[PDB]
Design a protein around this ligand. Structure first.
Ligand SMILES: [K+]
Ligand SMILES: [K+]
Ligand SMILES: [K+]
Ligand SMILES: [K+]
Ligand SMILES: [K+]
Ligand SMILES: [K+]
Ligand SMILES: [Mg+2]
Ligand SMILES: [Mg+2]
Ligand SMILES: [Mg+2]
Ligand SMILES: [Mg+2]
Ligand SMILES: [Mg+2]
Ligand SMILES: [Mg+2]
Ligand SMILES: [Mg+2]
Ligand SMILES: [Mg+2]
Ligand SMILES: [Mg+2]
Ligand SMILES: [Mg+2]
Ligand SMILES: [Mg+2]
Ligand SMILES: [Mg+2]
Ligand SMILES: [Mg+2]
Ligand SMILES: [Mg+2]
Ligand SMILES: [Mg+2]
Ligand SMILES: [Mg+2]
Ligand SMILES: [Mg+2]
Ligand SMILES: [Mg+2]
Ligand SMILES: [Mg+2]
Ligand SMILES: [Mg+2]
Ligand SMILES: [Mg+2]
Ligand SMILES: [Mg+2]
Ligand SMILES: [Zn+2]
Lengths: 46, 98, 307, 201, 183
RNA sequence: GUGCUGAAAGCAUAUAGGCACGAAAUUUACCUUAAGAUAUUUCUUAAAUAUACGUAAGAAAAUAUUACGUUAAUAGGCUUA
RNA sequence: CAGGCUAAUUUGCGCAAGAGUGUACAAAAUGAGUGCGCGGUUUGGCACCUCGGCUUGACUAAUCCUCAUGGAUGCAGAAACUAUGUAGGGUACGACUGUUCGUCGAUUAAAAAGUUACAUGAGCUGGGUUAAAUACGUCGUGAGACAGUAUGGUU
RNA sequence: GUAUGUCAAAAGGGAAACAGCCCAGAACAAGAGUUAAGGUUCCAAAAUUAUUAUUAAGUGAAAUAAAGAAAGUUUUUAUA
């Protein structure tokens, strides 16, 4: 997982999702990739 | 700077309303002078120049009523309320393109 | 606010009108929520009031030498029971010693008159987990209330020390002794920062003041000996206070309660040593009304010299 | 939703019972949204769920079908629950008739599993406890939730069964939480043919 | 001066008003159509109407120096209406002058310790004049979590029908029709 | 950080919705101080009670706090161990 | 001197892009010259205004150790690297120097930083800087002087 | 330096507090008086006044943090 300010897809399997969003926080944008775990990224700090 | 001149970058819906009515009140002063002279077949050079290169409140765009030109701004636009004596001064036309 | 987050007036009583049976959420505050989040730690039985009689060592039959304090029980009776419907929590009130009737006031003389118990010296409440911890009023508690090896918590008032400096009270190190120091060998030094820090001495600043003479608890102290005749309960370690001071002994809260067989055996011994505990209590309560209504009418003398 | 429009074929034996709009009073909320209690009974058991009222079910029994529909397709809340409510019914119908299963493969030297009783920690009478030897100093034991049947055809193979898929898969994920497959030797617990790419070295 | 000459007893008397935090309010709601979407009065909008009653500013004889306020019994404070995510994202702060002793708590956590009645008191409290009458006016706010309260007999009535009841209006108009049978 | 179910978006997805795991921080628990509702089948019709005085102390800068004052072991003395 | 405004600079940091290194392969690690910024710790500008140690704290989190955790052809294990949460507690002893800084010895889970008038002198210390005395070197015709050196010097 | 004004030597209303900004030049009173700047849910005098849209982040609401990223959302213009 690499926390960047500019997250980008690095292959065809990378997907953009917004997780950890609930009634208390807005959440972060992620780059989930089942192929390469090195493509994991996150936008924003806790 | 440490001296605070708290001046918001934008106007409120109340300042915009009075601004529209001030621009509209100056249009009636010139229309009254222009019509009163036409009845006598007379004209004043100032009135001709105003009606030629200055628009009416109904012909101005919202950005021309509430903002002015300022080359020192990143977008060359500045709140009209930041002009000295903006309430009692006539400003309607900005450089072309900006 | 005045205390916490609540801005409620201190004379309003809206509790009974906020019931969970009406579909409302169970509050996280109040006697009901407080007793629940302390269920595991609250002891099952009551405690005893004992007097610190000194310190010795317990010598074992194989080479053991254990420092221990001697706590004596002096006519420890059960005076009252605090129920959750009348007081808001479960607890047992225990007595200690005796006192002269003249030195006891009229409010307390009638308090014991309605119980059949002689005036006591000290009273203290011991909170229990539930209603099973309440005992009959008018039963004496002996050292056998505990068993050898049982760990207990001792609560007593520490030795007073009067006005203490910064070294004894808060462990301040002090300053130099001879390398130029001028009149500041045991002083506290700086009391805080300057204008940036608040231009004031912050609350909670550690300073000289009075020390000791406050309650203190020592937890997880085993019981090495239990003798009923002498009335002593030898516990391992030290205990707060001076000799002759009263201390509170109760089962450890950070430990598991004693076995069920023990909690029942002890309760079963009170019914044998005092088979008549409700008959003597109701008889004492019945006499209180006669004497109470005799004081009201003013005919109390008619009953004193009645026989 | 291209899935909500697809009718739901009710196989023989399965019976769907649609309740009526009801609102359970809540003192903490000023307005509760009505729902519909949908019961799906059959040979293996009975499952129930509470769907929003705006989802309309035209249960036509003569043809043994039931299609879903919403009152407004432009609402984001109705489009989402339209597909979700359909997927749940499909699992319910196919769970009470056939049943859902999950296979766990234990890879590694010294990995075993047994199904026996533990009357000491039984949450309910006769609860089965899956005992796992996963290279831990202590024994790993987990009680199957009420309504599931766990079996072990082989020491290195577990077979979970139940009518509720969410309950079966949620339990299969708890057993796998003890040994997640590693990428160096494949040791771990694999669920339903799950695999993992290994390292060449 | 004649307007003020008379019996000012009933003008200064304390009236016990009532309002439910769950009943829709067509006036204090931001939604006005459809009628089935009319919500109750939000936390702050209800507190602004209550603060006006506690001050007595609704009376034609109002004076800020005189405490001519009234009582307001608020029920169903557990279902207090809020918009957005205020319930879980709003925070209340506290400091006792000791650096490091900053106490924070959310609305949902404050509603679990002291119920929704404390959330409505802090709102009304901040809407009252910051003077020596702020504690007396706030103390006349009777907030309760459910429908029960010890003031079911104090609520103002008109012909036996409590204000806000089903038929309180027709009970008022019936009493004024008889008052016109006089010179 | 890590999951189950699962659509919007036939797939996918721990994104909406419904559930769960998870830290020397937090909260509770634990300890002390403050707080003083409340309890006693408690006391009082000019009192109950408290103080003062005297002998003191588990107390101690003053104050306060906790006992006792002859129907008494509070301090001292004496006697014994 | 301190505070204030500013932020060129910094022994303070972040993001963006990616030449290049990484046997292979941009983004495990690494990141030329740059761009967009934060922050107010260093050396500076302006002129609104005319030290270190000891004792005792409080606070920040940009983290040295301890807890949870992602990535790691370059995660076998162990250890370490990088990064994400997190400031509860700890971060010691001694030699040299007036020293903060810095060098070194030997232990340790680790021996991390910063703000607060570069916290604290109506709480202490006075070694440094430091008026009168004196000598040295240098400069000055000289009296004298020096960001020089040395001994002493009412807190 | 230049142009204009204010303060200096100008009170009063507005900008939370305010020498220099926005209005307006205080001889003293009375008035639900008429207005300026500014504002009108409560503190606090006056709209919880109407119309059409956007935002779901308390963003924002009287002192705009940047480049940049991204199946957040709306609209328009092409297009299947
Ligand atoms: K001060
Ligand atoms: K995550
Ligand atoms: K999935
Ligand atoms: K305690
Ligand atoms: K100057
Ligand atoms: K805000
Ligand atoms: Mg300033
Ligand atoms: Mg003493
Ligand atoms: Mg010393
Ligand atoms: Mg000395
Ligand atoms: Mg101050
Ligand atoms: Mg799916
Ligand atoms: Mg948990
Ligand atoms: Mg009584
Ligand atoms: Mg008397
Ligand atoms: Mg004394
Ligand atoms: Mg004696
Ligand atoms: Mg100057
Ligand atoms: Mg890993
Ligand atoms: Mg903790
Ligand atoms: Mg300093
Ligand atoms: Mg000082
Ligand atoms: Mg000398
Ligand atoms: Mg002058
Ligand atoms: Mg002025
Ligand atoms: Mg304002
Ligand atoms: Mg008027
Ligand atoms: Mg008003
Ligand atoms: Zn990828």
């Amino acid at each position: 997982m690499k926390v960047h300010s500019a997250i980008k897809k690095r292959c065809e399997h990378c997907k953009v999702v917004r997780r950890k969003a609930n009634k208390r926080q807005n959440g972060y944008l992620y780059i989930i990739c089942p192929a390469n775990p090195r493509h994991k990224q996150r936008q924003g700090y806790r | 700077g440490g001296l605070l001149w708290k001046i918001p970058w934008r106007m409120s819906k109340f300042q915009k309303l009075r601004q529209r009515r001030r621009l509209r009140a100056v249009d009636n002063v010139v229309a009254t002078i222009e019509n009163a002279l036409a009845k006598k077949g007379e004209t004043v050079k100032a009135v001709e120049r105003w009606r030629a290169e200055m628009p009416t409140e109904a012909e101005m765009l919202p950005k021309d009523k509430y903002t002015i030109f300022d080359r020192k701004e990143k977008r060359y636009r500045k709140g009209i309320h930041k002009l000295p004596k903006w309430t009692r001064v006539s400003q309607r036309v900005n450089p072309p393109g900006y | 606010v005045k205390y916490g987050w609540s801005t409620l007036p201190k004379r309003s009583r809206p509790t009974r009108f906020n019931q969970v049976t009406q579909g409302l959420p169970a509050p996280t505050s109040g006697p009901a929520a407080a007793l629940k989040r302390r269920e595991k730690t609250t002891p099952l039985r009551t405690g005893v009031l004992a007097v610190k009689k000194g310190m010795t060592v317990f010598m074992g039959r194989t080479g053991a030498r254990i420092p221990c304090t001697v706590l004596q029980l002096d006519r420890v009776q059960v005076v009252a029971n605090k129920t959750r419907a009348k007081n808001g929590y479960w607890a047992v009130q225990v007595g200690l010693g005796e006192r002269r009737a003249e030195n006891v006031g009229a409010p307390q003389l009638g308090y014991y008159e309605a119980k059949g118990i002689p005036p006591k010296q000290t009273l203290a409440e011991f909170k229990v987990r539930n209603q099973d911890g309440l005992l009959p009023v008018g039963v004496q508690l002996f050292p056998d209330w505990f068993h050898v090896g049982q760990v207990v918590d001792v609560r007593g008032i520490t030795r007073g020390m009067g006005f203490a400096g910064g070294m004894k009270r808060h462990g301040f190190a002090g300053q130099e002794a001879s390398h130029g120091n001028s009149l500041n060998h045991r002083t506290i030094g700086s009391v805080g920062g300057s204008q940036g820090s608040g231009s004031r001495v912050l609350p909670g600043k550690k300073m000289p003041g009075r020390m000791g003479a406050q309650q203190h608890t020592v937890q997880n102290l085993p019981i090495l000996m239990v003798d009923n005749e002498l009335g002593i309960v030898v516990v391992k370690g030290a205990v707060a206070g001076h000799k002759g001071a009263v201390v509170k002994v109760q089962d450890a809260v950070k430990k598991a309660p004693p076995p069920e067989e023990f909690v029942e055996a002890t309760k079963q011994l009170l019914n044998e040593r005092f088979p008549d505990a409700e008959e003597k209590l109701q008889a004492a309560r019945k006499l209180h009304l006669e004497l109470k209504e005799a004081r009201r009418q003013g005919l109390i003398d008619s009953l004193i010299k009645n026989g | 939703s291209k899935l909500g429009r697809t009718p739901l074929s009710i196989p023989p034996g399965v019976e769907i019972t649609i309740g009526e709009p009801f609102v359970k009073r809540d003192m903490t909320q000023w307005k509760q949204q009505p729902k519909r209690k949908i019961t799906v009974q059959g040979p293996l058991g009975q499952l129930e769920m509470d769907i929003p009222d705006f989802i309309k079910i035209d249960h036509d029994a003569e043809a043994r079908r039931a299609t879903l529909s919403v009152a407004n397709r432009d609402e984001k809340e109705q489009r989402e629950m339209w597909g979700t409510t359909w997927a749940y019914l499909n699992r319910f119908i196919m769970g009470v008739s056939e049943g859902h299963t999950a296979v766990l493969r234990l890879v590694g030297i010294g990995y075993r599993a047994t199904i026996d009783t533990r009357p000491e920690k039984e949450e309910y009478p006769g609860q089965q406890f899956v005992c796992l030897k996963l290279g831990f100093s202590h024994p790993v034991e987990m009680g199957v939730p009420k309504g599931m049947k766990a079996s072990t055809p082989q020491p290195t193979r577990i077979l979970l069964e139940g009518i509720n898929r969410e309950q079966v898969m949620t339990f299969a994920a708890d057993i796998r939480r003890w040994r997640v497959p590693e990428p160096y030797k494949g040791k771990g617990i694999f669920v339903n043919g799950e695999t993992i790419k290994l390292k060449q070295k | 001066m004649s307007q003020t000459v008379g019996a000012t007893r009933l003008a200064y008397s304390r009236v016990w008003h009532h309002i439910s935090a769950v009943t829709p309010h067509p006036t204090l709601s931001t939604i006005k159509a459809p009628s089935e979407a009319i919500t109750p009065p939000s936390l702050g909008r209800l507190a602004s109407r209550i603060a006006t009653i506690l001050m007595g500013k609704h009376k034609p004889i109002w004076d800020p120096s005189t405490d001519c306020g009234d009582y307001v019994v608020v029920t169903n404070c557990a279902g207090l209406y809020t918009t957005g995510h205020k319930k879980w994202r709003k925070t209340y702060y506290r400091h006792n002058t000791r650096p490091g002793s900053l106490q924070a708590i959310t609305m949902d956590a404050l509603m679990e310790k002291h119920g929704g009645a404390e959330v409505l008191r802090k709102a009304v409290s901040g809407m009252l004049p910051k003077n020596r009458l702020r504690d007396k006016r706030l103390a006349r706010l009777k907030a309760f979590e459910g429908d029960a309260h010890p003031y079911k007999e104090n609520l103002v009535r008109f012909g036996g029908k409590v204000v806000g009841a089903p038929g309180w209006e027709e009970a008022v108009k019936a009493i004024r029709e008889a008052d016109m049978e006089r010179l």
